[PDB]
Amino acid sequence: TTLSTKQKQFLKGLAHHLNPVVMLGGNGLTEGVLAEIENALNHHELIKVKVAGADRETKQLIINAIVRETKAAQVQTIGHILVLYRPSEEAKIQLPR
């Protein structure tokens, strides 16, 4: 998913009003966590995934794997939160041109 600068910023602003819908723990990106992320992308398009207690390299492994498997766009990485977006066949969120 390739987002323009303006699209990414639009989604970053919207995600400020969202809570995380997936949380990772010590076991990282398990099969079940990936299914939760897929589910969340499907229903919500724009999601926040909490990745607490991850150092920079660990978090990067996780980000890379999520993007590879899901084809979601990275909207924002700040601290322990990953904001991701993937469009739906039935758009829920109006994305700017």
Structure tokens at 94: 């109006």
In the beta sheet, which residues pair with residue 78? 81
Under DSSP, is residue 39 helix (H, G, I), strand (E, B) or coil? helix
Question: Token match 């977006």: residue?
Answer: 85
Q: Phi first, then psi: what are they for 2, rounded to 5°?
A: -115, 120
* CATH number attached to the domain at 1-97: 3.30.110.60
The technique is: X-ray
What DSSP line would sit under 82-94, residue for residue?
Answer: EEEE---SS--S-
This structure's resolution (Å) is 1.4
CB atoms within 10 A of CB 32: 9
Which CA distances in Å does 50 have to 2, 3, 77? 22, 22, 10
Residue 24 near residue 48, CB atoms below 8 Å: no
Residue 40 near residue 47, CB atoms below 8 Å: yes
List, in order, residues 6 or more apart from 95 with CB less than 8 Å away.
Answer: 7, 10, 11, 87
Q: What is the DSSP letter of 72?
A: P
Under DSSP, is residue 69 helix (H, G, I), strand (E, B) or coil? helix
